């Protein structure tokens with residue numbers, strides 16, 4: 001029914017976010033093959049946000065290494081497409097911290113603070129969205145509309 | 160040691176490729192929720208090429224639905240990041256055709272025809288590359304350098 005964030009807007013947020021993640025990961029200073037910085041992507045919705053973010057991090061001198069789902073001694077940065085109930089991200093963060101990560105943070109593209117079932121605050125957020133059902137930029141409704149380059153609100157008369 | 164294809168070059172090829180896949184998939188005409196067109200992505204190297212291609216297909220009116228690895232009644236389009244020995248893509252195409260796909264083709268980003276162990280020709284190819292070891296745009300060496308926005312040839316003195 002309306003567009004919330006276009007691809008130009010989503011990239012602009014990820015400029016300062018990558019600039020933020022660059023500052024907070026300066027003293028550790030890890031490079032390819034040595035320590036890669038394990039980008040933990042949560043399939044399937046976060047594959048659009050992952051392919052764009054790992055490149056922008058490389059633009060600011062932050063190498064990456066991507067693992068997909070749905071260790072130890074190395075830093076971990078979990079990437080979710082949307083942070084709503086935070087239940088799925090809670091289980092991943094706890095299950096990952098078991099294999100002694102040298103650091104762990106979370107980076108989400110769309111954050112819905114009003115739809116939480118448990119208290120959870122991500123370290124880096126691209127954009128905030130009110131409590132509505134949205135698609136685009138990896139977000140889907142029954143495995144569809146992920147190809148939309150913008151985060152939009154779907155019309156309810158499709159159900 | 161040199162750059163083979165930049166992101167601007169890789170996108171330009173995917174313009175005519177998406178224009179090609181749009182023509183060959185016109186009469187079937189399948190839309191979200193109905194028949195999605197199952198984009199079959201082969202992790203991990205093909206996640207950069209998948210996030211860029213599904214959007215470009217949407218720009219030419221071609222909806223998608225992405226599945227990841229490493230059915231029946233619906234069209235299948237497998238996407239690989241690089242087509243070298245074609246052994247990995249051979250096993251996927253055969254294993255997918257068992258569950259009665261209403262169509263099946265292959266779309267690769269980088270094709271190395273000189274490195275084949277078995278004869279295999281993909282329907283759509285973004286770009287051809289001579290028999291060298293390359294990284295970037297999802298391509299990796301020991302889970303690294305995927306974040307490079309361009310397809311480049313790595314220096315041998317890193318081994």
Ligand SMILES: O=c1[nH]cnc2c1ncn2CCCCP(=O)(O)O
Nearest residue numbers: 082084085132133134135139140141
């Ligand atoms: O706004 C949204 N767009 C797409 N997916 C979303 C959104 N908010 C939460 N999700 C997760 C859906 C799965 C939870 P379930 O309904 O399967 O239990």
Ligand SMILES: O=c1[nH]cnc2c1ncn2CCCCP(=O)(O)O
Nearest residue numbers: 241243244291292293294298299300
């Ligand atoms: O040029 C390339 N860059 C990155 N990966 C490539 C390339 N060519 C083939 N691959 C696959 C590697 C796995 C085969 P194995 O060595 O594990 O058997």
Ligand SMILES: [Mg+2]
Nearest residue numbers: 051052210211
């Ligand atoms: Mg892009």
Ligand SMILES: [Mg+2]
Nearest residue numbers: 045080081082
């Ligand atoms: Mg999700």
Ligand SMILES: [Mg+2]
Nearest residue numbers: 045140141142
């Ligand atoms: Mg979903």
Ligand SMILES: [Mg+2]
Nearest residue numbers: 204239240241
């Ligand atoms: Mg591959």
Ligand SMILES: [Mg+2]
Nearest residue numbers: 204299300301
């Ligand atoms: Mg590899």
